[PDB]
Amino acid sequence: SRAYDLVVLGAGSGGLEAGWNAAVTHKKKVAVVDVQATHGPPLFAALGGTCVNVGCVPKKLMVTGAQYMDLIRESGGFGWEMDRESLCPNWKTLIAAKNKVVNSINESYKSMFADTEGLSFHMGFGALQDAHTVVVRKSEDPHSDVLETLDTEYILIATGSWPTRLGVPGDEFCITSNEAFYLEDAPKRMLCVGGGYIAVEFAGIFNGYKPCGGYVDLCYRGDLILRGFDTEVRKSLTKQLGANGIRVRTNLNPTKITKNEDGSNHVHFNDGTEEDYDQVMLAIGRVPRSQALQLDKAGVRTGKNGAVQVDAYSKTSVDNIYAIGDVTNRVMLTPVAINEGAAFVETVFGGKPRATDHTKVACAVFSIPPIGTCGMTEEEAAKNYETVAVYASSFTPLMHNISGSKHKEFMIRIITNESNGEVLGVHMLGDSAPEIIQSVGICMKMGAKISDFHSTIGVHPTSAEELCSMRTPAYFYESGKRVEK
Amino acid sequence: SRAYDLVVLGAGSGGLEAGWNAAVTHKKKVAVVDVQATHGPPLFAALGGTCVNVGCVPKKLMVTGAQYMDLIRESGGFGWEMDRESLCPNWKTLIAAKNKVVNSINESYKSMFADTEGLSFHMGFGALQDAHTVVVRKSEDPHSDVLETLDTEYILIATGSWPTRLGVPGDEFCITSNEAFYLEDAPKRMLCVGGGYIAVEFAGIFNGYKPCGGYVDLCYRGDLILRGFDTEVRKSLTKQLGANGIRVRTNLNPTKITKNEDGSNHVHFNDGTEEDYDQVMLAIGRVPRSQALQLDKAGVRTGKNGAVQVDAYSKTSVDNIYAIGDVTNRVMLTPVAINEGAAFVETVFGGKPRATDHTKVACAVFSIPPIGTCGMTEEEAAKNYETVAVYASSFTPLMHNISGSKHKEFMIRIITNESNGEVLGVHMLGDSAPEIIQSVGICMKMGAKISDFHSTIGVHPTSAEELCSMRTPAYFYESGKRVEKLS
Numbered sequence: 001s002r003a004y005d006l007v008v009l010g011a012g013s014g015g016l017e018a019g020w021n022a023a024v025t026h027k028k029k030v031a032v033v034d035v036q037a038t039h040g041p042p043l044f045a046a047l048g049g050t051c052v053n054v055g056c057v058p059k060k061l062m063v064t065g066a067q068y069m070d071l072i073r074e075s076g077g078f079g080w081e082m083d084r085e086s087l088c089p090n091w092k093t094l095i096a097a098k099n100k101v102v103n104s105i106n107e108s109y110k111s112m113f114a115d116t117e118g119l120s121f122h123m124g125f126g127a128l129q130d131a132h133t134v135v136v137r138k139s140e141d142p143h144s145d146v147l148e149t150l151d152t153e154y155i156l157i158a159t160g161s162w163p164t165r166l167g168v169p170g171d172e173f174c175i176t177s178n179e180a181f182y183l184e185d186a187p188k189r190m191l192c193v194g195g196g197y198i199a200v201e202f203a204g205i206f207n208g209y210k211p212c213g214g215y216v217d218l219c220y221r222g223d224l225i226l227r228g229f230d231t232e233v234r235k236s237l238t239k240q241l242g243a244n245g246i247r248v249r250t251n252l253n254p255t256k257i258t259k260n261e262d263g264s265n266h267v268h269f270n271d272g273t274e275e276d277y278d279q280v281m282l283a284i285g286r287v288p289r290s291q292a293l294q295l296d297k298a299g300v301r302t303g304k305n306g307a308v309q310v311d312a313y314s315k316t317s318v319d320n321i322y323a324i325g326d327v328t329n330r331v332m333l334t335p336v337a338i339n340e341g342a343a344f345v346e347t348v349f350g351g352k353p354r355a356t357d358h359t360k361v362a363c364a365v366f367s368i369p370p371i372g373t374c375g376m377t378e379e380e381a382a383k384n385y386e387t388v389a390v391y392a393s394s395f396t397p398l399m400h401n402i403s404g405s406k407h408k409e410f411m412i413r414i415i416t417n418e419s420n421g422e423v424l425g426v427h428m429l430g431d432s433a434p435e436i437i438q439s440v441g442i443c444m445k446m447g448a449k450i451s452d453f454h455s456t457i458g459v460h461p462t463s464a465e466e467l468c469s470m471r472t473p474a475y476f477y478e479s480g481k482r483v484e485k
Numbered sequence: 486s487r488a489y490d491l492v493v494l495g496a497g498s499g500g501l502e503a504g505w506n507a508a509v510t511h512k513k514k515v516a517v518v519d520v521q522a523t524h525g526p527p528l529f530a531a532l533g534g535t536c537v538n539v540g541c542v543p544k545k546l547m548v549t550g551a552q553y554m555d556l557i558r559e560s561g562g563f564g565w566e567m568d569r570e571s572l573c574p575n576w577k578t579l580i581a582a583k584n585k586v587v588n589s590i591n592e593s594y595k596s597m598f599a600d601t602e603g604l605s606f607h608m609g610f611g612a613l614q615d616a617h618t619v620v621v622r623k624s625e626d627p628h629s630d631v632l633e634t635l636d637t638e639y640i641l642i643a644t645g646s647w648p649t650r651l652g653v654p655g656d657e658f659c660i661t662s663n664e665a666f667y668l669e670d671a672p673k674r675m676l677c678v679g680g681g682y683i684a685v686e687f688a689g690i691f692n693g694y695k696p697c698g699g700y701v702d703l704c705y706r707g708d709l710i711l712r713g714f715d716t717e718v719r720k721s722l723t724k725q726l727g728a729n730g731i732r733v734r735t736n737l738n739p740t741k742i743t744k745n746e747d748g749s750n751h752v753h754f755n756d757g758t759e760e761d762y763d764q765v766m767l768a769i770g771r772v773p774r775s776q777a778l779q780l781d782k783a784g785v786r787t788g789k790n791g792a793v794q795v796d797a798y799s800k801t802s803v804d805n806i807y808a809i810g811d812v813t814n815r816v817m818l819t820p821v822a823i824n825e826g827a828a829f830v831e832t833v834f835g836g837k838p839r840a841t842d843h844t845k846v847a848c849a850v851f852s853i854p855p856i857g858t859c860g861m862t863e864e865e866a867a868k869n870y871e872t873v874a875v876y877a878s879s880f881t882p883l884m885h886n887i888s889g890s891k892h893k894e895f896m897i898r899i900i901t902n903e904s905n906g907e908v909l910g911v912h913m914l915g916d917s918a919p920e921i922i923q924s925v926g927i928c929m930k931m932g933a934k935i936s937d938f939h940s941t942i943g944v945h946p947t948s949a950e951e952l953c954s955m956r957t958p959a960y961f962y963e964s965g966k967r968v969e970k971l972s
């Protein structure tokens with residue numbers, strides 16, 4: 001009948017998972033459309049998606065790089081003597097080394113397509129024509145030249161999401177997480193606008209790679225950063241970012257930005273103040289990237305903010321068209337899209353359908369120090385459950401008596417349903433948190449109870465062993481009310 | 486009736502757990518006997534036991550200190566430029582800082598006894614007289630002066646374990662893990678004898694703190710270090726210790742040691758060779774410390790190598806006498822003794838008895854890189870189960886492409902029962918392994934299956950997320966035989 005079984009728009013974490021699966025485990029003809037093969041400023045995203053190119057992968061590298069500032073400082077207490085005063089890192093060699101790693105992954109994906117039969121990569125901007133026709137153009141402009149016309153059985157949208165700007169005058173003088181990865185020099189005076197994942201993680205990066213006398217400011221619209229996270233973790237992180245040199249600034253928002261005649265930018269604020277930053281990054285949000293795909297033409301229902309509306313199996317308003325990952329706007333994470341993709345393949349090409357379990361998904365924030373959480377916060381579980389129990393524990397790892405970094409407190413907070421003991425949320429702040437929370441997320445998926453935690457013999461000495469020592473709740477919530485007992 | 490409800494011999498991980506619980510949660514009169522209050526070379530162990538004084542706590546500190554060698558080297562790739570050539574660490578300031586931390590904990594235990602009513606610390610060497618009399622002497626010599634005579638209801642032995650020597654001529658020229666913590670200088674030429682936890686961890690320490698042109702040798706009796714661990718992990722660790730600068734030396738054993746007239750030691754080996762090391766540490770083993778407690782007098786049954794024989798609740802041959810921790814010689818770990826102690830209290834003073842679950846206990850080895858394991862190895866599970874499935878995965882974390890340390894491979898190996906899918910063992914090598922294996926150990930205690938692992942959505946990017954990506958077994962064991970597929 002048709003040329004291909006599946007055209008996947010976007011060669012991202014979702015795209016590549018679905019594409020590869022359909023083609024290899026099920027031997028289907030799969031065409032995968034994306035913008036370019038290698039990471040690069042003009043268009044940013046490439047083969048591998050945001051995760052590989054302008055997202056998690058390079059992010060994590062630069063976070064690791066920044067973390068050495070703390071680690072070099074700390075080594076002194078342990079006997080490691082070296083010339084420490086006036087010492088700042090080389091940004092250029094970091095971005096160099098970063099590019100090398102990303103590019104090598106880009107390459108690994110090029111040869112994957114060459115070696116896999118059924119799979120083929122088609123470079124350009126895919127757009128819908130009808131239920132069975134994806135049209136690859138050279139531009140986002142639907143008047144640019146048509147490169148290919150792909151006749152297909154199934155269409156999968158996996159084009160992800162894109163940085164949100166803010167309508168203020170001078171908006172286009174600012175950078176986003178995209179351009180951040182390709183800055184020529186590390187900024188002396190940095191402003192990070194917003195209080196989310198990116199905002200926080202990148203503050204940590206710039207703060208690590210700032211040159212002499214440099215400083216990073218982080219301004220947030222509301223009054224406590226990282227809304228959605230455990231409030232006791234958010235407060236403790238705000239302190240530790242401060243202690244590490246990041247000047248957190250709540251209830252503040254830029255209003256106008258102009259360019260000084262030396263390159264730098266002048267920022268007008270909410271409280272009417274004015275300061276000069278070398279660069280200003282907008283970590284405002286990520287709107288689904290579907291404005292271009294002409295979903296109207298093929299009749300694909302797009303709900304709130306362009307997000308493609310799907311059911312539990314990713315099926316859209318049309319039976320043969322599907323969408324996965326950030327473009328659906330459920331839980332915007334790489335492993336989620338991968339799981340959504342793998343499920344999609346099992347659904348239509350596997351015979352045995354399956355829906356991605358969106359609840360109790362463990363994730364992490366790669367700040368310094370990092371956050372590792374899974375499940376429900378206090379606020380939510382209290383406004384959803386009869387009687388809840390809140391366990392808490394804070395401690396300084398013994399090494400930090402020597403290391404000098406006495407601000408580095410490790411925090412665990414377990415949130416349970418008091419009626420049966422079931423663990424509804426675990427929230428951790430400190431080094432190793434992302435690693436620990438992973439195996440935690442297995443227990444939560446296994447419907448584990450607080451009794452399962454504190455009956456397991458500990459592994460001494462670790463930060464993680466403290467999960468099994470929390471016996472008595474710090475306090476309770478009795479139908480919405482913060483009750484002491 | 487009696488002066489005290491409980492006399493606990495040894496203020497260790499087991500002792501202080503039981504002591505505190507009986508005294509605070511149950512308000513009993515508890516006397517706790519130990520050798521000294523603060524850590525110190527003449528006698529080594531003190532308030533807090535081996536764990537606090539000459540064991541885990543200072544160990545972990547020095548491992549953290551050593552790990553900076555790798556971390557400073559690695560930072561270069563990321564842009565961190567500094568004078569690296571000819572750079573070695575200061576050992577003296579480490580031991581200084583180490584002493585400060587340990588002493589601080591010694592002190593917090595002193596004031597604990599002063600603030601807790603029911604609890605009292607009694608300094609000296611406790612020994613049994615009968616079912617109800619513990620006699621504190623000033624020496625291990627049962628002819629030294631009697632300091633106190635404690636009349637009690639229950640006696641709890643928690644005196645732990647002690648380094649084993651080896652009968653070779655010149656044996657007493659070598660140090661152990663005890664004296665290691667109090668060396669004046671870091672040795673240039675180090676020999677670590679043995680292939681166990683301590684042997685490996687300490688090799689990593691000295692290798693971190695070695696001065697210029699220094700080197701650490703690790704000789705082991707058999708042919709693969711860390712016997713008892715996942716054999717694929719053991720082999721990978723041996724390579725990585727090598728790549729890190731530690732010269733592993735299997736099927737080798739010293740036979741005679743003499744002192745050169747400059748301080749150093751001359752070592753005669755198994756293969757008849759001879760070399761010169763500044764220090765030689767014997768990580769041979771740990772025999773339970775009960776040789777002195779006169780158990781014979783009180784009639785307490787001591788089995789293999791002095792270990793006090795107990796049942797599942799720690800009760801000895803006499804009803805009122807108990808033993809916990811390393812002195813029983815079950816699973817010699819701090820959290821085990823703590824759990825044994827907490828159970829003991831619930832058994833006799835809590836009303837509701839309880840036995841410590843010794844199977845599926847997660848532990849770790851603090852080498853560079855560290856090991857984190859829980860449960861059964863291939864070998865054992867194959868010689869115990871009908872049909873088994875072995876999953877494996879190795880990978881280099883992307884950061885190590887830049888960091889330069891390309892030898893640092895993270896390894897996960899899951900061992901299941903094929904019939905049911907139940908996870909019988911998880912074995913990990915690499916940074917963060919001790920931290921990850923902890924929450925793993927919860928799942929295995931919850932009787933988790935391989936299906937539970939790979940259905941959990943991952944946390945990207947971590948080393949731990951790879952636990953949920955192992956779907957297809959690398960191979961199988963079909964009743965003892967290493968089969969590549971199933972029939």
Ligand SMILES: Cc1cc2nc3c(=O)[nH]c(=O)nc-3n(C[C@H](O)[C@H](O)[C@H](O)COP(=O)(O)OP(=O)(O)OC[C@H]3O[C@@H](n4cnc5c(N)ncnc54)[C@H](O)[C@@H]3O)c2cc1C
Nearest residue numbers: 010012013014045049050055126159160325326332333334
């Ligand atoms: C800075 C940053 C850090 C992040 N860190 C993490 C993290 O640590 N952990 C985590 O779990 N998640 C992280 N994320 C989110 C993660 O990157 C996404 O959730 C994930 O990439 C979504 O997968 P996807 O397939 O839906 O989209 P993507 O992986 O981004 O793939 C979309 C692809 O579609 C292509 N495309 C766009 N338009 C078209 C079109 N017209 N035609 C054809 N192709 C098109 C794009 O070029 C892109 O490559 C991070 C995101 C950012 C921005």
Ligand SMILES: Cc1cc2nc3c(=O)[nH]c(=O)nc-3n(C[C@H](O)[C@H](O)[C@H](O)COP(=O)(O)OP(=O)(O)OC[C@H]3O[C@@H](n4cnc5c(N)ncnc54)[C@H](O)[C@@H]3O)c2cc1C
Nearest residue numbers: 495497498499530534535536611644645810811817818819
């Ligand atoms: C170098 C090293 C590193 C280790 N690292 C770890 C690790 O990382 N994780 C882990 O889980 N375990 C580790 N261990 C083992 C752990 O420390 C022990 O398993 C734990 O301390 C056992 O508790 P215990 O009460 O039985 O013995 P201890 O905690 O050692 O207590 C015994 C106490 O009894 C006292 N005593 C001795 N004789 C008498 C007497 N005659 N009368 C009265 N008191 C006496 C001693 O002074 C001592 O303080 C390590 C051990 C060593 C040697």
Ligand SMILES: NC(=O)C1=CN([C@@H]2O[C@@H](COP(=O)(O)OP(=O)(O)OC[C@@H]3O[C@@H](n4cnc5c(N)ncnc54)[C@@H](OP(=O)(O)O)[C@H]3O)[C@@H](O)[C@H]2O)C=CC1
Nearest residue numbers: 194195196197198199221227283284285286332364365366
């Ligand atoms: N480690 C990980 O797993 C990572 C995940 N991600 C994913 O992508 C993320 C999207 O990026 P990001 O924007 O950094 O994260 P978020 O969109 O989740 O959070 C950033 C938010 O932007 C601020 N903000 C929103 N609107 C405005 C405005 N008009 N003016 C000023 N400030 C504003 C704050 O919103 P508010 O006032 O409502 O609190 C702040 O909380 C998340 O959705 C996450 O799913 C991204 C990076 C890392």
Ligand SMILES: NC(=O)C1=CN([C@@H]2O[C@@H](COP(=O)(O)OP(=O)(O)OC[C@@H]3O[C@@H](n4cnc5c(N)ncnc54)[C@@H](OP(=O)(O)O)[C@H]3O)[C@@H](O)[C@H]2O)C=CC1
Nearest residue numbers: 679680681682683684706707712768769770771817849850
């Ligand atoms: N992080 C942790 O959890 C730690 C736990 N520990 C605990 O204490 C440990 C006891 O100390 P340790 O000695 O370091 O570990 P082990 O007694 O478990 O093992 C060390 C062994 O020494 C070697 N050896 C034994 N006998 C001789 C001999 N006669 N001549 C030469 N070599 C010999 C090897 O024995 P073989 O030939 O049988 O393989 C080697 O396996 C463990 O039992 C463990 O329970 C100790 C340190 C850290």
Ligand SMILES: [Sb+3]
Nearest residue numbers: 051056057334
């Ligand atoms: Sb990612």
Ligand SMILES: [Sb+3]
Nearest residue numbers: 536541542819
């Ligand atoms: Sb210990």
